[PDB]
Design a protein around this ligand. Structure first.
Ligand code: HEM
Ligand code: HEM
Ligand SMILES: [C-]#N
Ligand SMILES: [C-]#N
Lengths: 191, 190
């Protein structure tokens, strides 16, 4: 077991439902075509996750105000916090590509939003760190997530057209998830 | 353009140029993107009517999106759509041509306020739904980029150049929706 990873065992139901998920998928233009290519993206990314993790956390680590969210109160990075989260982020890459986007998935999406938010941040790993990740950065991060995935998607010799489809699927699926994560941040009734 | 008040908003944004610098860093937006978004402008400018049809065609294709433009009777308000269309058209140019300075930031606060319940329906003085749910503003980052993509290639630029214009557009669209979140986000959580 991955420490802290509680997919399918959240014991709180998400405040958004499967119909909400359907309508949100429509808003990010996500169809059965993207179901085919997000799973293909998984097949491509799964063997490269160590270098993907290094690239992603290298980006976070290169900006003081982003690495900030993993720091101890004294301003120094908490490497145990970073390492524990890294294992769950690694799993998230596989989940995004491999899970059915069903109620169990939606319950975990609510959980992931809660963990970035002050509601549950720092509780999973029992660490002491900054209390909230400003929402502005969750949205911002849609971009660098997609930009870090893009080069890796080419590395199994899929055609340019297939790589482009895998990248677009990833983009849709990343946007969809960050939308859902906004829930605990948004003024009640405005989501 | 009716309702377009860029430069003359009379609220200062609650985020500042330092906040903008840090958020640009989070979406990997640099001077290179400033150059390529300007080029994207040059490419898109004379294609705006097709862009608009493609964009509002998508909104109009799903009842739960077209909803945000509807009158109480559930039918689209055509006055509202028409007036917004002109400002959206201008936004394509503003995104490409404006310096992302304080006046830009102030208008980004305003655009967020106008999607949000705070100022929605007020600019055009229409009776419509009170709030655009935030979930959709984030969602719409994707369709904005997928709408621009094919037009970015229509003036003969190489795939390498189209990709730079496209990535710049993506970054700049994500940056703006991040700022538009402000009025939606619980105080202290942004
Ligand atoms: C597209 C946006 C983002 C994605 C896809 C993403 C992905 C993830 C994932 C998959 C996890 C682990 C979830 C789990 O516990 O199973 C996580 C946790 C975490 N992420 Fe992100 N994240 C994003 C935004 C951000 C931002 C902007 C930061 C700021 C540095 C950040 C820093 C963290 C931190 C500090 C945790 C640990 C939260 C906790 O205490 O539980 N994330 N992220
Ligand atoms: C990336 C996301 C989005 C972008 C780039 C965008 C762009 C714009 C722009 C440029 C305007 C005019 C702003 C001005 O007054 O100068 C506007 C207004 C408007 N948009 Fe969006 N928009 C987005 C999300 C959405 C969504 C999800 C909807 C839902 C259908 C929507 C529906 C509307 C409506 C109803 C108005 C008029 C609001 C008012 O009463 O002033 N927009 N949008
Ligand atoms: C988050 N990583
Ligand atoms: C907005 N359109």
């Amino acid at each position: 077991k991955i420490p802290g990873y509680t997919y399918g065992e959240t014991e709180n139901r998400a405040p958004f439902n499967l119909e909400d998920l359907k309508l949100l998928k429509e808003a990010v233009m996500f169809t059965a075509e993207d179901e085919e290519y997000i799973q293909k993206a998984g097949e491509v990314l799964e063997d490269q996750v160590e270098e993907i993790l290094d690239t992603w956390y290298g980006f976070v680590g290169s900006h003081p105000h982003l690495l900030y969210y993993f720091t101890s109160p004294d301003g120094t990075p908490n490497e145990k916090y970073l390492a524990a989260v890294r294992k769950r982020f690694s799993r998230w890459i596989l989940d995004t590509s491999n899970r059915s986007y069903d109620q169990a998935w939606l319950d975990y999406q609510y959980e992931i939003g809660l963990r970035h938010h002050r509601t549950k941040k720092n509780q999973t790993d029992n660490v002491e760190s900054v209390p909230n990740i400003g929402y502005r950065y969750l949205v911002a991060f849609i971009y660098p997530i997609t930009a870090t995935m893009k080069p890796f998607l080419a590395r199994k010799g899929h055609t340019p057209e297939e790589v482009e489809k895998m990248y677009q699927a990833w983009f849709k699926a990343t946007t969809l998830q960050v939308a859902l994560w906004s829930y605990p941040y948004v003024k009640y009734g405005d989501f």
